[PDB]
Design a protein around this ligand. Structure first.
Ligand SMILES: [Mg+2]
Ligand SMILES: [Mg+2]
Ligand SMILES: [Mg+2]
Ligand SMILES: [Mg+2]
Ligand SMILES: [Mg+2]
Ligand SMILES: [Mg+2]
Ligand SMILES: [Mg+2]
Lengths: 175, 84, 136, 104, 55
RNA sequence: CACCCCCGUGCCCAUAGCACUGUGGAACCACCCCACCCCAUGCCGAACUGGGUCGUGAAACACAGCAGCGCCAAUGAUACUCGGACCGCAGGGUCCCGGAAAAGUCGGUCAGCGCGGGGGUU
RNA sequence: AUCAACGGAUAAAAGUUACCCCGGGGAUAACAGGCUGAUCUCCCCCGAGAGUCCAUAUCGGCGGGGAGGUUUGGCACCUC
RNA sequence: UCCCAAAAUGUAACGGAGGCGCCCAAAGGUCACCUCAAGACGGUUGGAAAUCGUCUGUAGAGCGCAAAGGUAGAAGGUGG
RNA sequence: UCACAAGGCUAAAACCUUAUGAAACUCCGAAGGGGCACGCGUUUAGUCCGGGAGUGAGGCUGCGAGAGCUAACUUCCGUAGCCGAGAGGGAAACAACCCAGACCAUCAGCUAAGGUCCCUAAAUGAUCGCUCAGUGGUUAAGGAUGUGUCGUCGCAUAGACAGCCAGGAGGUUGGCUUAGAAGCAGCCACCCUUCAAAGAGUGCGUAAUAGCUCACUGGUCGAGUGACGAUGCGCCGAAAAUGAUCGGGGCUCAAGUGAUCUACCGAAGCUAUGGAUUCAACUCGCGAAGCGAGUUGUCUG
């Protein structure tokens, strides 16, 4: 991913295939402007549980993880991106996509797997030690089975930012 | 005479003349007696050389210059920083 | 449909969607491209359309609710006062607002149930997917 | 409660009166009877009890008041405003008043 | 700053007609040399569209 | 304002607050102690109030740690909008020019500044 | 002092006119026209289901989009 | 009184809501003192609430009435 | 505070995660608006006393609202402009919209809004494009291998998508359901063998069978072929009463339409030349105001 300019007036970029950007940590919070097309092909893969380096037109390489995106309401199209500069040793709370594996023994009788929490906030993970997903096996589940947060296998060192009695995956009855 | 009702329900005339608000502002010269605020409760409370009438009206005790102190809503004060 | 407790009457004004995400609750959604007043009966019409298509289960999220009361002309006049409490309830929908979202159904199954529900609506709509995680 | 200090302390209308205020700490037995200036964040006179209590602890009543009244003239002070912290103006503090009310 | 009235005051809000009066312009074409001070610069910005401004 | 601490009292009244945790007793302050009176409880020295220690620092307080919660909060961007100019039969929308949020994120914080009196550097 | 018609005409006051009269009003209604098109008339989208079977040979729940100006109106613009 | 009312004041409709035509000899003056609603847990007639007790508690209560502003350093509650 | 969506949970109320709506909700909160001081800087009104009035039916448009059906050339407030009381150009015609405020004279000149085929003033201009419907010169839901241009998945000379010859299973008339239900009136599943390959199965069919073909496989050709979407211009949807038409003629051999660039036309606007008026200051007549003349500025719907 290759950035270009950085003015306060976005009039120059708006007409072209460019999206406004920002990257911060606590020591450097510079202005930015990258390619729409290039950002999309990459972001669609990465999201909050992935990172890429941004080399601004002057030879300055920095690693950054996406914090928040803001798209147009009338369009689907993103109009601005908030990148957060990575430390190397200790990060923040990250939203991880909760996924499902194997057909349930509850989905058979007339049930359906309801992923109540689409993205999970996880305390103390580790930078570049961020899991790109969060797979949860559901074969053990019958109709009326609620899988809480304090029942999920996290990958080494990671802790949970949400309550342990809070429903993440449930098998739902018919009608 | 009917068995229905006295005054007919579901109305929409009724309202009242009414006034209110600030009269003299931050950086105005005032003579003694000059009303600087008309209000309901104690939006603004009295300060230096500022009195408070029966109807919470804020008036000048002594001539000078109106000064507003905004501590953060509720803690609102009008004062007179005497010119001399 | 209608609301349980209230005030009786209202007004009218418009400008671009305030509180409508993309992917909350469901996997696929149905978004407005035009502003309108969604009648209680049009939502009910859309719901039944989707519910019938997805025979058993129940995974339809109606993110819009009719809360605005609209009025009427008894038959003639104007030589009287403000009118008709009980005409119809409405949901002020502005472009961007997710009206409906489905779960536990395929891309193809959802494509259709929304294509059907679209024909019952007084505005143009667009079918959507995931990649919106704003604030939770 | 703590509402009683703030109560009398609020009813002590600072600059309108023109006068200076007289504070008292008779919650303990080391009464601080201070003369405090309104505008400036200053304490002018004052008379304690820790520095030689005269055997007495509650009977030191007039002693601290007399000490104060005398210290007032040494500075010039003649106009005052007494502030009974939370102290129901009756014994210990009622004496200190008369002790100063007759000493100037 | 060289100012010239290129557009009519008719149909324009009161204040804008009042500003063109303060600038000393009475006819379309009326040109005049002008002061470079916040107040005089402000008047000229307030009727910017009715005037042809040089430098 | 030599310096440490304490008791009073300010300006400032959450970047000052809470929670959790630790230090301080016989200088100061707190409980404590007894009360027949002064004085007091629509009942009860609980509180006011009087006489006083000891005993303790439990409780309260003061001080110190800490970023779990509160509180504070950018940059960017958007919403909205003064003025200029348009689109649509309409609900409604766009462009140019300044102005400019709210929420959120980065992050910042267990304050700062006076006056007086008391006790310490054995 | 419900002088409450609340700046209060007298201390003191209801009806009726198709037997009617005068001064005016298109400042204002009935007819008609006009603008509008809720209502009215018609047409179109979708396809639940009816049709042995098969949505569309016929028919079209709930809903949606228009056209027309022949209805009942709205409004009160020329014409009293 | 609130809303309409376009962040000054003002602003219409047979627009949307709702009160007043009195009351209080203390519900006034002043000086003292007091501090609320609710919830959890524990208990006599009881037991959904009540009278009691501790723990949370800007106020979620009260203010003779309608609503709005205001208010616990009291405008709330009690006495001389 | 009131309303409200999905789940947790508990004996519902509360509380928790997610998600909202508000004229009479607000932890917040503009742009703007108003008071005052200053004029740091341009302008030319203001106030106070007194004489004479007229007017107290407004109208339209944009914007902000209510009423109304988010109708009306509707009604009622706020706000800005014009008409009223406004001529002149433009909008075919046309109070109001766009431009512009007419002191008088000229067979002078420049512009504005608008315009530049002919009616009819002035480019049948210049460049790159688009649209062949007379769209331009009646609206929509919905519909479409219409053409122009950017994009997102995929199968592909290890030989595709289409045509052509051959084949298309056996369990098994999958079970259930039923008067039957056998790939095809409706639930559950979509597991297995043989293999170059064949889904307990797409559309038609008879009363269930059969039938007739597709999903998948090979041979011969030989090259790009297909599905979502975006967006420009166009197509269908598109029926009204006396005779038809975009003002007409007529235009694509653009006189349509997006972007750019000059040039010209065009008013009572600005200008040239002359001339009159209003007020004002600057000269002089006259014993004094006051009024003459006289320039210069200024004014005159
Ligand atoms: Mg905040
Ligand atoms: Mg501007
Ligand atoms: Mg504007
Ligand atoms: Mg228009
Ligand atoms: Mg802007
Ligand atoms: Mg008629
Ligand atoms: Mg439409």
């Amino acid at each position: 991913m290759e950035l270009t300019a950085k003015p306060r007036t976005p009039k120059q970029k708006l007409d072209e295939s460019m999206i406004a950007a920002v990257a911060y940590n606590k020591e450097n919070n510079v202005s930015f402007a990258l390619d729409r097309k290039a950002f999309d092909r990459a972001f669609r893969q990465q999201s909050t549980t992935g990172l890429f380096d941004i080399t601004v037109e002057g030879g300055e390489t920095f690693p950054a993880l996406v914090k928040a995106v803001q798209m147009d309401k009338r369009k689907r199209a993103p109009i601005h991106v908030d990148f957060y500069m990575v430390t190397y040793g200790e990060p923040v709370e990250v939203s991880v996509p909760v996924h499902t594996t194997g057909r349930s023994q509850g989905e058979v009788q007339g049930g359906l797997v309801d992923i109540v929490v689409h993205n999970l906030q996880i305390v103390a993970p580790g930078p570049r030690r961020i899991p790109q997903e969060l797979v949860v096996d559901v074969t053990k589940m019958n109709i009326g089975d609620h899988i809480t947060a304090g029942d999920i296998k996290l990958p080494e060192g990671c802790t949970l930012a949400a309550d342990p009695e809070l429903t993440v995956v449930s098998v739902l009855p018919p009608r | 005479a009917h068995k229905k009702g006295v005054g007919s329900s579901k109305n929409g005339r009724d309202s009242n003349p009414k006034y209110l608000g600030v009269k003299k502002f931050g950086g105005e010269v005032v003579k003694a007696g000059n009303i600087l605020v008309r209000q309901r409760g104690t939006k603004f409370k009295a300060g230096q050389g500022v009195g408070m009438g029966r109807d919470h009206t804020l008036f000048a005790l002594s001539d000078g210059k109106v000064v507003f102190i905004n501590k953060g809503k509720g803690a609102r004060f009008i004062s007179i920083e005497a010119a001399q | 449909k209608r609301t349980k407790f209230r005030k009786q009457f209202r007004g009218r004004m418009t400008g671009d969607a305030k509180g409508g995400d993309y992917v909350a609750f469901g996997d696929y959604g149905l978004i407005a491209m035009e502003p309108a007043w969604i009648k209680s009966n049009q939502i009910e019409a859309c719901r039944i359309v989707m519910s019938r298509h997805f025979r058993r289960g129940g995974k339809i999220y109606i993110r819009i609710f009719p809360d605005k009361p609209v009025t009427k002309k008894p038959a003639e006049t104007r030589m009287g006062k403000g009118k008709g409490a009980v005409e119809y309830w409405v949901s002020v929908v502005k472009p961007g607002r997710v009206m409906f979202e489905v779960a536990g159904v395929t891309e193809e199954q959802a494509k259709e149930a929304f294509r059907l529900a679209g024909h019952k609506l007084p505005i143009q709509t667009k079918m959507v997917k995931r990649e919106v995680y704003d604030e939770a | 409660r703590r509402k009683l200090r703030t109560r009398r302390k609020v009813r002590t209308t600072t600059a309108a009166s023109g006068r200076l205020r007289l504070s008292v700490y008779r919650s303990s037995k080391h009464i601080y009877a201070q003369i405090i200036d309104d505008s400036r964040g200053q304490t002018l006179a004052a008379a304690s009890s820790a520095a030689l209590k005269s055997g007495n602890k509650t009977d030191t009543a007039a002693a601290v008041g007399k000490a104060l009244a005398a210290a007032a003239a040494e500075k010039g002070i003649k106009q005052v405003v007494f502030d009974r912290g939370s102290y129901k103006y009756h014994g210990r503090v009622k004496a200190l008043a008369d002790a100063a009310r007759e000493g100037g | 700053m060289k100012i010239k009235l290129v557009r009519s005051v008719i149909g324009r809000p009161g204040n804008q007609v009042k500003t063109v009066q303060a600038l000393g312009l009475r006819k379309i074409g009326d040109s005049r040399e002008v002061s470079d001070t916040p107040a005089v610069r402000g008047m000229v910005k307030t009727v910017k569209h009715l005037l042809e401004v040089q430098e």
